[PDB]
Amino acid sequence: MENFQKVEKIGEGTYGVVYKARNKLTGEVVALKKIRLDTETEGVPSTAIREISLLKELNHPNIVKLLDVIHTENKLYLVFEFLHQDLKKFMDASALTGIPLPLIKSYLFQLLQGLAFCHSHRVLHRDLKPQNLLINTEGAIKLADFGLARAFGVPVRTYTHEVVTLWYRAPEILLGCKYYSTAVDIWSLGCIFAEMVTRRALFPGDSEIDQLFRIFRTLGTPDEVVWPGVTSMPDYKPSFPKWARQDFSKVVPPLDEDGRSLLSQMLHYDPNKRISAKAALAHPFFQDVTKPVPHLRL
Amino acid sequence: MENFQKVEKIGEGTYGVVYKARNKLTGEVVALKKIRLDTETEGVPSTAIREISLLKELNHPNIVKLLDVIHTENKLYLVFEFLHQDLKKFMDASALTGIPLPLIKSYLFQLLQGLAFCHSHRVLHRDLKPQNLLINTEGAIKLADFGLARAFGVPVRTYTHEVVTLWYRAPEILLGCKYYSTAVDIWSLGCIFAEMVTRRALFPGDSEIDQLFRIFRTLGTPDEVVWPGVTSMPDYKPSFPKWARQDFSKVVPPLDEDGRSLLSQMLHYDPNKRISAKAALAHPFFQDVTKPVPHLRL
Amino acid sequence: VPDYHEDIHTYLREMEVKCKPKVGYMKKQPDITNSMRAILVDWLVEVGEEYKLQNETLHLAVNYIDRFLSSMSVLRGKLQLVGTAAMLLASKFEEIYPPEVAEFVYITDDTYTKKQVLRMEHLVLKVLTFDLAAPTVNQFLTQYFLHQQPANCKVESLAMFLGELSLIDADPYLKYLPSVIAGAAFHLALYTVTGQSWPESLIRKTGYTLESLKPCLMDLHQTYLKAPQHAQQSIREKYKNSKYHGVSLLNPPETLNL
Amino acid sequence: VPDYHEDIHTYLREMEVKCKPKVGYMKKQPDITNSMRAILVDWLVEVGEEYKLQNETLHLAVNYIDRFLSSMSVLRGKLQLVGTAAMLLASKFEEIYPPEVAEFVYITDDTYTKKQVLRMEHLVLKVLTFDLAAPTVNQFLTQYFLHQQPANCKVESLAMFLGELSLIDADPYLKYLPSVIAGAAFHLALYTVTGQSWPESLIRKTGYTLESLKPCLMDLHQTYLKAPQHAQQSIREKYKNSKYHGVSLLNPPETLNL
Numbered sequence A, B: 001m002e003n004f005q006k007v008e009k010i011g012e013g014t015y016g017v018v019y020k021a022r023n024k025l026t027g028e029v030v031a032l033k034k035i036r037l038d039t040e041t042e043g044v045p046s047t048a049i050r051e052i053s054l055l056k057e058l059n060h061p062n063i064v065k066l067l068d069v070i071h072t073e074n075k076l077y078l079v080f081e082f083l084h085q086d087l088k089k090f091m092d093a094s095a096l097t098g099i100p101l102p103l104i105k106s107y108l109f110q111l112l113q114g115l116a117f118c119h120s121h122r123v124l125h126r127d128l129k130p131q132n133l134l135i136n137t138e139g140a141i142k143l144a145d146f147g148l149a150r151a152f153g154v155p156v157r158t159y160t161h162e163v164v165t166l167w168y169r170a171p172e173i174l175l176g177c178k179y180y181s182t183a184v185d186i187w188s189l190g191c192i193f194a195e196m197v198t199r200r201a202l203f204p205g206d207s208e209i210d211q212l213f214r215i216f217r218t219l220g221t222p223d224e225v226v227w228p229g230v231t232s233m234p235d236y237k238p239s240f241p242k243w244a245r246q247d248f249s250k251v252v253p254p255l256d257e258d259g260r261s262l263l264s265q266m267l268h269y270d271p272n273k274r275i276s277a278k279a280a281l282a283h284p285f286f287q288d289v290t291k292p293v294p295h296l297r298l
Numbered sequence C, D: 001v002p003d004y005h006e007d008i009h010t011y012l013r014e015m016e017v018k019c020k021p022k023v024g025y026m027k028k029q030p031d032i033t034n035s036m037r038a039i040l041v042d043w044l045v046e047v048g049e050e051y052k053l054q055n056e057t058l059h060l061a062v063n064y065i066d067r068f069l070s071s072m073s074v075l076r077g078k079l080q081l082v083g084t085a086a087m088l089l090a091s092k093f094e095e096i097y098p099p100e101v102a103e104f105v106y107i108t109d110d111t112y113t114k115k116q117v118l119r120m121e122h123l124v125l126k127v128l129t130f131d132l133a134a135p136t137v138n139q140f141l142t143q144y145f146l147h148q149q150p151a152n153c154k155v156e157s158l159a160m161f162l163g164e165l166s167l168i169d170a171d172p173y174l175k176y177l178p179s180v181i182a183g184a185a186f187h188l189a190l191y192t193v194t195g196q197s198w199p200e201s202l203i204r205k206t207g208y209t210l211e212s213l214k215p216c217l218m219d220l221h222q223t224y225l226k227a228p229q230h231a232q233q234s235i236r237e238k239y240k241n242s243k244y245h246g247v248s249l250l251n252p253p254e255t256l257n258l
């Protein structure tokens, strides 16, 4: 840990603060997530245990790389590959601009690649949103913050309830369905996709019911025809206003026929019919996909 | 390192300071060979480099277990399996009684096996002597101290000029022969075998020429007949006193025909003829090996 | 979501070999024995019941333990400290609500301190290089069960019952991969409850056959058979509960006919 | 001879597969490329010439370098520091008398300090986890050389010269085992100098046939043919030398007709 020179404070979270640093020896810029543990308290936090253990299996060009874990008696340093911005700020600086379709498609392509990889190694991210997706100065985007992540089983079990930041939380979860899985991450990605296009959160609810209600208004209140089982779900109320399903082209106006399709499949109610990352890679939306390299602002 | 309680001190010298320690969490007792790096001069010692790289490449029950290597900025402690004592101490202890032949045959049996493993893995020990051989409370003896070992190539090149501890140094070394092989270790071991039986060093030279002469006085001065090429080596002098070979029963008295046989073969002038660890293992002497427990004072 | 079943099955099959512990570790191990280990895993079964932990957490703790012991020598007096740290880790990793470290110090009744339990946790982490997402027998059982026609909860719980029994005894199960044991556990359960055998669709899936499973099946059978008189009894007494359909009460096949 | 010669060959053949670097690691390296790598290896050749290091040391240095760069992201600027440290280590492991650090710092001509070189040395040791006894084309060439009757020194220097030309070019060489390059390098020499080929003796030993060693041989021959116009030329220079019997000056076969 002496071959690193701190360079600044990046983004603090749970375990501790995150510095920027450079390996004085090889020149490689990295991010150092630190943990002082809970020495005479909780001990190594479960988030860090799930994050380090799962993250050390996921080696992929589209998942931030945990380069090393530095163990000392009183501190644990997690050395990550350094990425400049997160989608959240990138879009913010895209004032006027708008992320051009080519980059949205590139980004969507990369995210599915990295997410399909996670699902193939029984890992649910459960926290996809633009803050957690980091981009670099070469046109790449990668999934980050696997603190909420968890290794799943086949078949799945009942996992922690209410996961995923609200706006990006899937309908399965809000209805308090017994089991959720991989489809939850696909919902978050459908929302980020609509968001990259419109530059605005798709379902910016303030409570779970507001969220369901925004969801229903845009895709219609699901019934037993569209989602066999909805009406018997824990948090499904027969009093729910039944909204007609909005014409998809009105959901994200700038999108073509293809992108509409992909999005409609990503935002599919029934989690069993909602498209897989793996299968989304082969959609016509991506037939022209390239790797536009964006100029960053830092 | 904060998990080890330093108990005693042992073989401190050259590099090591060798302490006897216990892991405060598991209760395991290790032998810590601390090594001092030259942070601003020479860096990590070649001794440590070869020793660690080869030891962690030699997994056998008659080669000491290197358990861990603790890698600090300024220090480097080798964590090995703690074995009760070296053969040099067990031997001194056995002064007055002698190591029972059945235990001897056993010890030499185990060494030849470990050595055979080193040799079959292109590794030369080059410092075989009682002190560098360790034993445990159950009847096992292991090759230790690989600080002088080197990985060899076929055919052998020209390796480091005169290595091995004088008393156990083989004639080729002494005579400044061009290359050396696995046979230099066979000699050393042979000398060790006699030393265990006669309870005294076979050739206690007080110099390279004294050493040469003690060898000659015993085995007889070698000629082109016994060692085709002796006369032609860099340190051979035509002015060598031509001594005559002594009856082996004079040499190692307690030893029987096989013992004298196996020994005469581990002490062959011509290295090319000197028995191998693989062969020696086969040797009749061993026909009835067991695994006696030594009466330790451990 | 079958869309990932085979990538995951194939992934687990690959990782199970990387978390494989030194199959000959007890021999080389100085102060502890198989029997002591059996004493430890049984206790952990109790701890799992006490804190109502998941079975997967049980399996995970044991996996961690066998791996720790495969490279670290441990004193009989120090073995439960390892067991508690592995159980704690297994808990944080798998549980929605893991017990607090105070609960774990309590269950090793007055024995160890919490700084001790915490320092061991850090050490189990160092030895295991943070590789905690280990494939367990339960993870495979869970997939296999999907090849029942139709699903029989008694076969399921029995399979689980037996897979857990294999945890107690390092000799002989420390040499069988989780997937194999999960195959033996499943077949022997299916047979004991429905007379049916290792399904063809599982041969396609796993590639394992009744004949690939014989060695392990022979062992698992004897274990099921001798179960009533095993020194340890927590799993038997645990699988009496309605939660597991009281399958420990079921009578094992006198023969397998293989 | 009689016992270990095979054990050893066999052992090496086992390790060479464990000692392999990611064949396309350079594509994942953001600032460095195979060209810069070539520049680096050629410089190293010059360094060995300079300090008269054993050819085996050159081979070890590149080994450790590909393994390091396969795991560690490095900038063009620190690239030579990884080289100097890799050479440092190879010298300590291989040579009877390795140049002191002062010498290694001097060759970088004030580019880096003695502390950086020393700090990189420890880093290359951490990353490579002290595993420095790497098999090399040289080791295998050495054994193969025994199976040549009569022993043609020119063939030896040529073989040495060929497998050394391979160290320079990650593409395509990085995808062959040392044993194979040793073979292709061997046959190509025997033929180029004495119209003969890969001996059955050697085939029974290695199990290599002129057609299993064909892909490599095909590349090796092109590399050989274009040696004159490769940006890197220290190996040609070093091999015009008298103790290498100007093998570089030799004329490579226009064809092989394999």
Ligand SMILES: Nc1ncnc2c1ncn2[C@@H]1O[C@H](COP(=O)(O)OP(=O)(O)OP(=O)(O)O)[C@@H](O)[C@H]1O
Pocket: A010, A011, A012, A013, A014, A015, A016, A017, A018, A030, A031, A033, A047, A064, A080, A081, A082, A083, A084, A085, A086, A131, A132, A134, A144, A145, A146, A147
């Ligand atoms: N690898 C990294 N590269 C660049 N910046 C990083 C990296 N890791 C963390 N950061 C910055 O810190 C902010 C917080 O994000 P991250 O989710 O990675 O970890 P954290 O918040 O420190 O901890 P936790 O995982 O508990 O949330 C991010 O928005 C990110 O910009």
Ligand SMILES: Nc1ncnc2c1ncn2[C@@H]1O[C@H](COP(=O)(O)OP(=O)(O)OP(=O)(O)O)[C@@H](O)[C@H]1O
Pocket: B010, B011, B012, B013, B014, B015, B016, B017, B018, B031, B033, B064, B080, B081, B082, B083, B084, B085, B086, B131, B132, B133, B134, B144, B145, B146, B147
């Ligand atoms: N496993 C061990 N158990 C007990 N003592 C050991 C062990 N390994 C080494 N020692 C002690 O240190 C002594 C020295 O051999 P070791 O290789 O440790 O060298 P050192 O003295 O540090 O350096 P050198 O290489 O110069 O001998 C042994 O003779 C023994 O007394």
Ligand SMILES: [Mn+2]
Pocket: A013, A131, A132, A145
């Ligand atoms: Mn975050």
Ligand SMILES: [Mn+2]
Pocket: B011, B131, B132, B145
């Ligand atoms: Mn010593």
